Write a protein that binds this DNA or RNA. Structure first.
Ligand SMILES: Nc1ncnc2c1ncn2[C@@H]1O[C@H](COP(=O)(O)OP(=O)(O)NP(=O)(O)O)[C@@H](O)[C@H]1O
Ligand SMILES: Nc1ncnc2c1ncn2[C@@H]1O[C@H](COP(=O)(O)OP(=O)(O)NP(=O)(O)O)[C@@H](O)[C@H]1O
Ligand SMILES: [Zn+2]
Ligand SMILES: [Zn+2]
Ligand SMILES: [Zn+2]
Ligand SMILES: [Zn+2]
Lengths: 676, 676
DNA sequence: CTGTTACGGCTCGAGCCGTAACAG
DNA sequence: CTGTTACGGCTCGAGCCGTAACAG
């Protein structure tokens, strides 16, 4: 029917909830980090919709009614193939080659297959159409000397329209290519025989421009792209294809996108929906809520304290609902307050000389030390390059002795003012089931000593290393401390089940005999942080670490959770807590690349508090954030622009946000003037 | 929108046609064999719909608007896996195990995973849940001695409901299982806690019964199934899943199904469509046309003479259209006439003694010789087993000395009355690009001699083998007579393009110099049969073979077409022409397994004429046909029934169709009484 | 001339945890 | 007591075409 009825969903931490999502409408799922929105969407609806279609050619839900095939558009990147480019992915190269073979004037007969690099007819004989000959320097990729990177035969390059061949057309940026195709002149016969192709090309280019990627080049390889750029390219391609009756699931479509493009992105999403589809956008932006037809709010907390549908309905009912977390922040009951007094530089600056990496226009920038510094700018302005490829790499090479090649820069002044450089990202903190937050924070070494300092341990002569599931002697011998066994089937992939010897306790019978304060090591490792905070009140050495973990918002997690199952936000919060627990020497540099990726308003407030605490501790924090709430609390803002692509790479404004708001020709300043 | 607009389609032999298929409606595509309906549907619409969805996770059309994801349900069978059974495919085993774990009374706590054979918890330790231990006899599959084929642990078999465990329930036929579940009694608590599961099981069993497979057992392996049974199982599963907004493409759903189940199949198709889908059924049945909302007719002929949309609209407009081929047969302008005089047996009979293979109830049947004999019966009555597994195999072993194990039968009387056995099926006649209809019919040897009989060939001393693309000396040396070359790409599968040396002519420069009647060998091999009929009028030796090929309806095909690209109908017609060209000795046996699979009414009439010619030639033809038009023209009908499955396997009626129509308790007789 | 049989030949090392030692 | 550094250890052969020879 016209509803996606889900009854009896218990995936992950869902508390047996029932929902009725309307069909063919814009639906936004909102909740705190780890509340369960991501599980409820991806693991249930996307999984069921994909399985029910692939099986034609296993969620813990009871039954779902009215499920169309589901396509997931998330921030995922793959190496792909060298044959794939931006134009190939967007399916505009086919129309380009059709137009070239139809109305192309040469400078056998011209054929559409003659312009393709995926067929032997038009592919360059030397590089086989790849465009680059990868040779291992006595594998460094070098341009093909024959085709000069065009990846086509020399004969096919004679066909030109408007004075430009196919490679020159494909090398232009999307916006200027659309402008060139718009004002092109053709006779009556050419217009009659190439109306459909021109209309399709114009429509696809307009969709790509409206999405936000008006600076990309069609000749750029699809492999070398960011997550946001790839996701936006996929959204534009899906709009162009025009599939009907398909449920689309989006994970934070506004990630890595400036505030000025939000209206265009919302219009693009509405246009995609209007052709007979449904959207399940999982977004936390304030502007996105007001453009939706149905909001589903989970909570009220996270982990074991959430998973229930707190509120449902339109934005007005969400605001009027008192127990909804999202409505409290939307209505203005709780909000982030702009600081009254801002820190000032002490006279120590980091100046980068001759930064010309990628599209940077050989500029010099000064970064204050000891203050919270934010970097803004339009999409594709070169801020990410300028930070990651130059400053972080040079600092790592100078301090940590890391052998990573920096970008195209001359030198940097002020290296002696820092002692170490630390990068915090959503990368997982572990790849094996042998690490948990308890060991990463370092509190496990204290808990082991506390356990070994008991009367029974001294009586039995147990050492500090006995109570650890990583050495021989204390762990379970049957499962080798992993807690699971390997069972192989005849025609099925190997399955993993809990070990029968220890029942998943990870320790042998002898170890479990000891008990401190009525609990053994398994009970300690199988309790949440909010309980270990009260349990370890007497001991301050572990109390400090537990309180630090609780401060970053990890009061719902348990010390025994494997690092493999941790999400990006959990890993980032664990790293932040670990850095908080350390001893600040006043010479530490923290670099964060958009830390607000997938955080609610309350999580943003907590992260702002933690960042201010870290700055006040005596160190310096530099972040690249597009969120105005984080931006307005900064102490020094560097703006890059004034546009994206070849037009950008310069510096528009610098200084405190109050000074930046006074700059007329700056989008960030214009937005800051209104928000303040 | 609400239309699938296709503009500029030129796949295979389509003559650049434009169509506008309505959406969310029952659409039937009708045309002659080889007209282009199959191409237009599968190669264009299914391919585009599948690609546009797979690429998210290349037809010769210009653009298609409004394409939902497409699922194709056709008669294809795969080995699959031993883990897959009928219940697993139909997704009823999950509900069965849920019910057993919920309300099961035993004779850790009971768990749904305990009843599954795909998890180590409930899988039998010996056979690993497969159910059969395949060992190579000094690989014969024998039942597992531990679980006795149940493929489960002995502990889980104690759980019983209604006096039967899970294996006994899964071993019942679908109809009797539905009856058992319908009259089962349970208390108020059991009904309250298992209402949804029971409702789902009853609905799925009812769907399976309505489809037509009320005799299958849930424990039967999905691998050992026929094409029609697998297609019907897939249709029932797709109905059960309940996908919305998906285009469904069906290829003759009424293949291998009795006339009495047509109403149930049509109701099932309408029920599948009514939940918000679209159907593209490609059917030729007369009853199916009257149940359609839109009929698209191709033609007017086949091959190069077809590919254009002759007529469109409802059944009334199709009938009123004069140039439409389908309307002429629907309105009654052209029809098959029942013969007035029928041939009678001459006193030679083939008696099968002790036929007990599969569900045959140890019966004896007499087959007349020298007359056209048809075999009828309900679906799954054992006719196909009785013919293929017993009679054909025994005849092949006795005459062709083929070492194939026959079925469970005692002996056969009348083997000496036959000299050879010939089986005609839709199997391809060749697997390599070295065989074409010209060589298979045998006319190529005559054409080679005709070419070598010319003055120039004698002058140059060319032999008969010079003009053949299969030996060294006459063929092109560069491409070795294949006509295509192999080109390898760096990161792409090898592609094939026409050879540059010979331009696909398959012969060297010297051979092409010779010419007979103004045409060389390439021109002879690149002309249709309808042209070679007039070209070779003078020579009777090749004229007979060409006329024989033309008679079976292959006047649109060319002698140079590779056997790899031939479809099933083309291969069957080629085999029929080859058998016609031979010399009849009066002791030949022809066995056909539903030869009307994918044939129009005109094709059915032509096939009936060819079969009558073959019978009048002095041989005997035995076919297993479900088409009443073919049945009413037979001379001896053997009916098997009176039901399908364990209830069938007997003989209901025998003799001429007039006598069979007098039998009251026979479905075939009841239908023959009305049709005559 | 026509059918049959047999033969010949062709293709299909990296990252993290735990521990010992040293220095503040 | 706390931080750092170094080290040890663990896991991720069949089927078809062409031809020579023989018999009707
Ligand atoms: N490998 C590359 N080859 C060529 N051009 C590149 C490459 N990497 C980046 N660029 C370009 O150089 C600039 C880099 O900008 P960058 O700082 O990565 O973007 P950004 O501002 O962080 N945008 P966003 O991802 O939306 O947050 C852009 O104009 C890119 O198109
Ligand atoms: N391998 C097998 N194992 C067990 N039972 C089988 C097997 N093959 C067939 N059967 C059963 O034995 C009977 C065979 O009937 P069969 O003659 O194959 O069907 P049919 O009349 O041709 N039906 P259809 O496919 O609709 O045309 C049916 O009852 C089958 O369920
Ligand atoms: Zn090249
Ligand atoms: Zn164990
Ligand atoms: Zn067994
Ligand atoms: Zn060649």
């Amino acid at each position: 029917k016209d509803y996606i009825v889900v009854k009896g969903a218990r995936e992950h931490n869902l508390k047996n909830i029932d929902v009725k999502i309307p069909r063919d409408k814009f639906v936004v799922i909102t909740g705190l980090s780890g509340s369960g929105k991501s599980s409820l969407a991806f693991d249930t609806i996307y999984a069921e919709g994909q399985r029910r279609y692939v099986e034609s050619l296993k969620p813990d839900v009871d039954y779902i009614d009215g499920l169309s095939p589901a396509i997931a558009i998330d921030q995922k990147t793959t190496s792909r193939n060298p044959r794939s480019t931006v134009g190939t992915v967007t399916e505009i190269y086919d129309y380009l080659r059709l137009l070239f073979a139809r109305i192309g004037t040469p400078h056998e007969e011209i054929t559409p297959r003659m312009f393709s690099f995926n067929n032997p007819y038009g592919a360059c004989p030397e590089c086989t159409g790849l465009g680059s000959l990868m040779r291992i320097d006595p594998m460094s990729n070098i341009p093909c000397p024959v085709c000069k990177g065009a990846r086509l035969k020399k004969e096919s390059l004679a066909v030109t329209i408007g004075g430009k061949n196919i490679y020159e057309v494909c090398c232009l940026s999307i916006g200027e290519a659309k402008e060139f195709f718009a004002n092109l002149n053709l006779t009556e016969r050419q217009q009659l025989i190439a109306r459909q192709i021109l209309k399709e090309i114009n429509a696809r280019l307009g969709f790509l421009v409206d999405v936000g990627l008006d600076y990309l080049t069609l000749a750029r390889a699809a492999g070398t792209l960011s997550g946001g750029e790839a996701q936006r390219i996929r959204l534009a391609t899906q709009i162009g294809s025009g599939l009907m009756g398909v449920i689309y699931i989006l994970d934070e479509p506004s990630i890595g996108l400036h505030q000025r493009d939000n209206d265009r992105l919302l219009r693009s999403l509405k246009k995609l929906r209007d052709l007979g589809n449904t959207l399940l956008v999982v977004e936390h932006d304030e502007d996105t809520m007001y453009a939706s037809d149905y909001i589903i709010d989970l909570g009220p907390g996270a982990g074991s304290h959430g998973g229930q549908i707190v509120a449902e309905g339109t934005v007005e009912e969400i605001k009027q609902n008192p127990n909804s977390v999202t409505g409290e922040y939307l209505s203005g009951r709780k909000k982030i307050e702009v600081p009254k007094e801002r820190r000032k530089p002490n006279g120590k600056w980091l100046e980068i000389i001759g930064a010309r990496e990628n599209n940077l226009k050989n500029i010099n920038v000064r970064i204050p030390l000891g203050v919270f510094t934010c970097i803004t700018g339009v999409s594709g302005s070169g801020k990410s390059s300028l930070i990651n490829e130059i400053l972080y790499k040079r600092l790592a090479a100078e301090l940590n002795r890391a052998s990573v090649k920096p970008g195209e820069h001359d030198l940097i002044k002020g290296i002696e003012y820092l002692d170490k450089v630390i990068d915090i990202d959503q990368s997982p903190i572990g790849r094996t089931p042998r690490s948990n937050p308890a060991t990463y924070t370092g509190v496990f070494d204290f808990i082991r000593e506390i356990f070994a300092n008991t009367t029974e341990a001294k009586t039995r002569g147990y050492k500090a290393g006995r109570f650890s599931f990583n050495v021989k002697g204390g762990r379970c011998e049957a499962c080798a401390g992993d807690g699971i066994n390997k069972i192989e089937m005849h025609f099925l992939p190997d399955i993993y089940v809990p070990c029968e010897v220890c029942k998943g306790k990870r320790y042998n019978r002898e170890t479990l005999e000891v008990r401190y304060k009525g609990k053994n090591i398994a009970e300690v490792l199988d309790m949440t942080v909010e309980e270990a905070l009260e349990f370890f009140k007497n001991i301050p050495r572990i109390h400090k670490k537990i309180e630090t973990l609780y401060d970053v918002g990890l009061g719902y997690i348990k010390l025994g959770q494997s690092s493999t199952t941790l999400s990006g936000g959990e890993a980032q919060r664990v790293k932040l807590a670990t850095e908080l627990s350390r001893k600040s020497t006043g010479k530490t540099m923290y670099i964060l690349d958009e830390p607000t990726t997938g955080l609610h308003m309350a999580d943003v407030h907590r992260l702002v508090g933690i960042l201010h605490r870290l700055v006040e501790a005596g160190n310096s924090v530099v972040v690249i954030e597009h969120n105005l709430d984080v931006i307005k609390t900064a102490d020094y803002i560097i703006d890059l622009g004034p546009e994206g692509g070849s037009g950008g790479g310069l510096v528009v404004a610098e200084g405190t946000p109050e000074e930046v708001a006074k700059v007329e020709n700056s989008y960030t300043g214009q937005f800051l003037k209104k928000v303040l």
